[PDB]
Write an enzyme that holds these catalytic residues in place. Structure first.
Site, PDB file in Angstrom:
ATOM      1  CB  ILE A  32      49.733  21.240  34.995  1.00  0.00           C
ATOM      2  CG1 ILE A  32      48.550  20.241  34.673  1.00  0.00           C
ATOM      3  CG2 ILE A  32      50.787  20.458  33.874  1.00  0.00           C
ATOM      4  CD1 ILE A  32      47.695  20.499  33.246  1.00  0.00           C
ATOM      5  N   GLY A  33      48.648  21.693  37.971  1.00  0.00           N
ATOM      6  CA  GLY A  33      47.734  22.651  38.857  1.00  0.00           C
ATOM      7  C   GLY A  33      47.669  22.359  40.292  1.00  0.00           C
ATOM      8  N   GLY A  35      45.076  23.060  43.547  1.00  0.00           N
ATOM      9  CA  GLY A  35      43.950  24.000  44.161  1.00  0.00           C
ATOM     10  C   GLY A  35      43.460  23.397  45.551  1.00  0.00           C
ATOM     11  CG  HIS A  36      40.989  24.623  49.700  1.00  0.00           C
ATOM     12  ND1 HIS A  36      39.895  24.416  50.031  1.00  0.00           N
ATOM     13  CD2 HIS A  36      41.768  24.318  50.711  1.00  0.00           C
ATOM     14  CE1 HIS A  36      39.776  23.986  51.255  1.00  0.00           C
ATOM     15  NE2 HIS A  36      41.188  23.984  51.638  1.00  0.00           N
ATOM     16  CG  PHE A  37      37.514  22.547  46.287  1.00  0.00           C
ATOM     17  CD1 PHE A  37      37.120  23.782  45.658  1.00  0.00           C
ATOM     18  CD2 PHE A  37      37.453  22.438  47.782  1.00  0.00           C
ATOM     19  CE1 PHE A  37      36.643  24.990  46.431  1.00  0.00           C
ATOM     20  CE2 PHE A  37      36.592  23.583  48.450  1.00  0.00           C
ATOM     21  CZ  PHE A  37      36.151  24.546  47.951  1.00  0.00           C
ATOM     22  N   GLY A  38      41.437  20.393  44.870  1.00  0.00           N
ATOM     23  CA  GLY A  38      42.135  19.126  44.123  1.00  0.00           C
ATOM     24  C   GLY A  38      43.079  19.603  43.123  1.00  0.00           C
ATOM     25  CE  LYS A  54      39.296  22.070  40.564  1.00  0.00           C
ATOM     26  NZ  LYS A  54      40.707  22.237  41.146  1.00  0.00           N
ATOM     27  CG  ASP A 145      37.960  34.410  43.253  1.00  0.00           C
ATOM     28  OD1 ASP A 145      38.612  35.078  43.334  1.00  0.00           O
ATOM     29  OD2 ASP A 145      38.458  32.998  43.577  1.00  0.00           O
ATOM     30  NE  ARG A 149      42.961  34.709  42.985  1.00  0.00           N
ATOM     31  CZ  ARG A 149      42.736  36.152  43.736  1.00  0.00           C
ATOM     32  NH1 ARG A 149      43.580  36.778  43.456  1.00  0.00           N
ATOM     33  NH2 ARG A 149      41.497  36.086  44.101  1.00  0.00           N
ATOM     34  CG  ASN A 150      40.826  33.294  39.990  1.00  0.00           C
ATOM     35  OD1 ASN A 150      41.611  32.080  40.270  1.00  0.00           O
ATOM     36  ND2 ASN A 150      40.254  33.891  40.826  1.00  0.00           N
ATOM     37  CG  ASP A 163      38.600  30.197  39.834  1.00  0.00           C
ATOM     38  OD1 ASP A 163      38.668  29.186  40.491  1.00  0.00           O
ATOM     39  OD2 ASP A 163      38.417  31.389  40.602  1.00  0.00           O
TER      40      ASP A 163
HETATM   41  C1  LIG Z   1      52.744  23.763  32.346  1.00  0.00           C
HETATM   42  O1  LIG Z   1      51.907  24.853  32.696  1.00  0.00           O
HETATM   43  C2  LIG Z   1      50.829  25.008  31.911  1.00  0.00           C
HETATM   44  C3  LIG Z   1      49.528  25.039  32.532  1.00  0.00           C
HETATM   45  O2  LIG Z   1      48.685  23.801  32.643  1.00  0.00           O
HETATM   46  C4  LIG Z   1      47.431  24.026  32.834  1.00  0.00           C
HETATM   47  C5  LIG Z   1      46.773  24.015  31.458  1.00  0.00           C
HETATM   48  N1  LIG Z   1      45.509  24.250  31.485  1.00  0.00           N
HETATM   49  C6  LIG Z   1      44.712  24.235  32.557  1.00  0.00           C
HETATM   50  C7  LIG Z   1      43.468  24.613  32.341  1.00  0.00           C
HETATM   51  C8  LIG Z   1      42.400  24.553  33.511  1.00  0.00           C
HETATM   52  C9  LIG Z   1      43.306  24.635  34.756  1.00  0.00           C
HETATM   53  C10 LIG Z   1      42.407  24.591  36.032  1.00  0.00           C
HETATM   54  C11 LIG Z   1      41.094  23.605  36.326  1.00  0.00           C
HETATM   55  N2  LIG Z   1      41.844  26.112  36.065  1.00  0.00           N
HETATM   56  N3  LIG Z   1      40.735  26.440  35.699  1.00  0.00           N
HETATM   57  N4  LIG Z   1      40.545  27.558  35.942  1.00  0.00           N
HETATM   58  C12 LIG Z   1      41.614  28.262  36.494  1.00  0.00           C
HETATM   59  C13 LIG Z   1      42.202  29.480  37.095  1.00  0.00           C
HETATM   60  C14 LIG Z   1      43.237  29.502  37.610  1.00  0.00           C
HETATM   61  N5  LIG Z   1      44.217  28.423  37.654  1.00  0.00           N
HETATM   62  C15 LIG Z   1      45.481  28.718  38.206  1.00  0.00           C
HETATM   63  C16 LIG Z   1      45.808  29.909  38.734  1.00  0.00           C
HETATM   64  C17 LIG Z   1      47.195  29.656  39.398  1.00  0.00           C
HETATM   65  C18 LIG Z   1      47.880  31.014  40.047  1.00  0.00           C
HETATM   66  N6  LIG Z   1      47.602  28.385  39.346  1.00  0.00           N
HETATM   67  S1  LIG Z   1      46.684  27.507  38.456  1.00  0.00           S
HETATM   68  C19 LIG Z   1      43.675  27.197  37.251  1.00  0.00           C
HETATM   69  O3  LIG Z   1      44.497  26.192  37.292  1.00  0.00           O
HETATM   70  C20 LIG Z   1      42.489  27.103  36.771  1.00  0.00           C
HETATM   71  C21 LIG Z   1      44.436  24.323  35.036  1.00  0.00           C
HETATM   72  C22 LIG Z   1      45.432  24.313  33.711  1.00  0.00           C
HETATM   73  C23 LIG Z   1      46.632  24.333  33.798  1.00  0.00           C
END
Ligand SMILES: COCCOc1cnc2ccc([C@H](C)n3nnc4ccn(-c5cc(C)ns5)c(=O)c43)cc2c1
Length: 287
Positions: A32-33, A35-38, A54, A145, A149-150, A163
């Site tokens: 579902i996400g 990132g550069h670190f994982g 994460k 940051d 997006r964050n 973020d």
């Molecule tokens: C099916 O899509 C539903 C979204 O999936 C999720 C749900 N909750 C999340 C909670 C935290 C995170 C991660 C750890 N995170 N924490 N802070 C941030 C800030 C931006 N983003 C992202 C930004 C972008 C452009 N893609 S992901 C994160 O993924 C994030 C991702 C999630 C993804």
């Protein structure tokens, strides 16, 4: 965990941040996400609560990692993304556990064709971010940051500044540029003049970033300064330039943005003043 290594007073807080391996079911199958670190995955936490897990393995001092978690868990505000805890896995780096945010990151949400937030709605997202940042600034925390997006949105469309701390990553690598002298990957289009020059970040440089985030909201997720290339942004701004007033941005709100982009850091509004000013503009709208 070595409780001897930690600050003696923080040893109590560890049992509140640590999640037992049996408590968490992490679904590695669906991502579902990125990132550069994982990567980040779906997760089920026994309490049944839906969460985001994460990975950080794509670590440093474990004592430092845990204290970062402790500080992060002490934050509690409706517009700040919380930390549910940390789950330690034998064979692999520890996992970061965050509440599940149904509607993804703020920037993609406003870019979504199937959602139609009103001008008031977008100003409202701006207000919530100002509120979360006001909390974080009061905790003497500097985000470094802040960008659309964050920030992320839960099932109730509540906007949470995300973020940061253990959740910190580069989630859209396009907007990060390598500095010449120090190699650091900086979000230069969100950065204040002074930060571009010194790479020092402050609450006042968060305020500059917040101005750009307001602009993203009013443009519904448009890229700032497309006609500009990376570190040439210092020259562009020094020509006497700022981002232009989006078509549906209220004149008072544009004035807010300009204040956020004040050449003198100390002359930019506090996040408290932004909350005040934006709530007033917000109150003038219907629908
Ligand atoms: C099916 O899509 C539903 C979204 O999936 C999720 C749900 N909750 C999340 C909670 C935290 C995170 C991660 C750890 N995170 N924490 N802070 C941030 C800030 C931006 N983003 C992202 C930004 C972008 C452009 N893609 S992901 C994160 O993924 C994030 C991702 C999630 C993804």
């Amino acid at each position: 965990i070595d409780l001897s290594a930690l600050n003696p007073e923080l040893v109590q807080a560890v049992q509140h941040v640590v999640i037992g391996p049996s408590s968490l079911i992490v679904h590695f199958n669906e991502v579902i996400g990125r990132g550069h670190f994982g990567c980040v995955y779906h997760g089920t936490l026994l309490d049944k609560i839906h969460c985001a897990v994460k990975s950080l393995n794509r670590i440093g001092e474990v004592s430092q990692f845990l204290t970062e978690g402790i500080i992060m868990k002490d934050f509690s505000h409706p517009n700040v993304l919380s930390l549910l805890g940390i789950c330690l896995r034998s064979e692999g780096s520890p996992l970061v556990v965050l509440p599940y945010m149904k509607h993804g990151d703020l920037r993609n949400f406003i870019r979504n064709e199937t959602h139609n937030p009103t001008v008031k709605d977008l100003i409202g997202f701006g207000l919530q971010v100002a509120k979360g940042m006001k909390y974080l600034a009061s905790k003497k925390f500097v985000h470094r940051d802040l960008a659309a997006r964050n920030c992320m949105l839960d099932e109730k469309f509540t906007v949470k500044v995300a973020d940061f701390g253990l959740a910190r990553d580069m989630y859209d690598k396009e907007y990060y540029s390598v500095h010449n002298k120090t190699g650091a990957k900086l979000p230069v289009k969100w950065m204040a003049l002074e930060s571009l020059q010194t790479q020092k970040f402050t609450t006042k440089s968060d305020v500059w970033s917040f101005g750009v985030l307001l602009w993203e909201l009013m443009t519904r997720g448009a890229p700032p300064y497309p006609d500009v290339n990376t570190f040439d942004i210092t020259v562009y701004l020094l020509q006497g330039r700022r981002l232009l007033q989006p078509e549906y941005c209220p004149d008072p709100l544009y004035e807010v943005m300009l204040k956020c982009w004040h050449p003198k850091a100390e002359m930019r509004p506090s996040f408290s003043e932004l909350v005040s000013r934006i709530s007033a503009i917000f109150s003038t709208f219907i629908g």
